[PDB]
C-alpha cells in the first residue's frame, strides 16, 4: 500500500495473509468470508508467465495478523488449505479478467477480536455503493512504493471509485465489466494505491444502511503504483458472485 497508514488493531479482522512455507515468503493478501472460506485473486495461485501454479499443499493462510513478520501467538491463527478453486474463465493470458479464487480451509477457524468475516454484497448493496466518487478501503502488507520498501504492520488506505470511462481511457490494457478501478485523479490533491504484494486483499466499503463492512473488490493489477493518471484495478466481487455461490454449493 502506497501513501497509507498503519492499521489499528482489529481494524480489518477479515484480512488474511497467504504465506509460502519454504522458502518463507509473504505471497499475497486474501479475505475471510466465513469460518471455512477465504477469497483471493486467481493470479496469486495461478500465473504461468511467472512459473506460478500452487496446489493446496503448497501454501498456508495466516488469519488475525497485524505484524507482517512476527509470529503473533495466541492472536493469529494459521490454517492449511483443503482445496483451491480458480475461476474457470480466469484470463491469465491477457488482462487478468475474472481474477478470483476461493480457498477452503482444512478446519473451520475460531473467531475472535482479531478474526471475523467480511460480508459479500447483495445485488442491491452492490448497485447502491459501487458508484464513482464514493470511497472504499484497501489493506495489505505489500510494497510501500513502486520498486522492496515493506511495512512492519498492516497498511490501510481509503480511495475513491473512478468512473468507468476514466478507468478505460487511463490504460491500453483491455478492461472488462469484471473489473473496477479506484484512486485519486491527478489534481485531486491526495494520493494512494495498492502495490505489489497487496493482490488478493479486499477492497471494502462500509454500508451506511446497516453499518456492516462489505467486500466489493479484490486487489488485482495496475501499472506501477500510485502513478499520476493511473488507477488501481480490482476484481468486481458481486459480478462474480454466481461463481462463488456455485463453488461453495458444490465444494
Amino acid at each position: 500500500i502506497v501513501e497509507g497508514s498503519d492499521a489499528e488493531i482489529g481494524m480489518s479482522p477479515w484480512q488474511v495473509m497467504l504465506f509460502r512455507k519454504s522458502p518463507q515468503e509473504l505471497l499475497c493478501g486474501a479475505s475471510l468470508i466465513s469460518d471455512r472460506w477465504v477469497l483471493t485473486a486467481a493470479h496469486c495461485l495461478l500465473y504461468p508467465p511467472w512459473d506460478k501454479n500452487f496446489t493446496e499443499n503448497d501454501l498456508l493462510v495466516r488469519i488475525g495478523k497485524h505484524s507482517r513478520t512476527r509470529y503473533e501467538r495466541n492472536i493469529e491463527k494459521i490454517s492449511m488449505l483443503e482445496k483451491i478453486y480458480i475461476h474457470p474463465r480466469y484470463n491469465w493470458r491477457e488482462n487478468l479478467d475474472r481474477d478470483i479464487a476461493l480457498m477452503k480451509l482444512k478446519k473451520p477457524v475460531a473467531f475472535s477480536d482479531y478474526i471475523h468475516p467480511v460480508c459479500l454484497p447483495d445485488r442491491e448493496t452492490a448497485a447502491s455503493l459501487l458508484q464513482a466518487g464514493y470511497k472504499g478501503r484497501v489493506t495489505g502488507w505489500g510494497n510501500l512504493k513502486e520498486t522492496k520498501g515493506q511495512p512492519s504492520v498492516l497498511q490501510v488506505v481509503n480511495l475513491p471509485i473512478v468512473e468507468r470511462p476514466v478507468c478505460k481511457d487511463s490504460t491500453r490494457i483491455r478492461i472488462t465489466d469484471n473489473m473496477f478501478c479506484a484512486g485519486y485523479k491527478p489534481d485531486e490533491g491526495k494520493r494512494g494505491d495498492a502495490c505489489e504484494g497487496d493482490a488478493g486483499g479486499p477492497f471494502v466499503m462500509k454500508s451506511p444502511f446497516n453499518n456492516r463492512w462489505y467486500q466489493m473488490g479484490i486487489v488485482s493489477w495496475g501499472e506501477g503504483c500510485d502513478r499520476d493518471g493511473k488507477y488501481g484495478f480490482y476484481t468486481h466481487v458481486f459480478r462474480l458472485k454466481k461463481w462463488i455461490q456455485k463453488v461453495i454449493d458444490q465444494f
Binding site: L26, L27, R62, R68, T69, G142, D198, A199, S220
Partner: peptide, 25 residues
C-alpha cells in the same frame, strides 16, 4: 490492444533480510 505494462499485484520478500519469525509445529 496492449498488456505489455500490466503489473499483477503480487510480488514478495522478507524485508528486514532473511526473516519472518517461525510458526506452528
Amino acid at each position: 490492444a496492449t498488456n505489455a505494462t500490466l503489473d499483477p499485484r503480487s510480488f514478495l520478500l522478507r524485508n528486514p533480510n532473511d526473516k519472518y519469525e517461525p510458526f506452528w509445529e
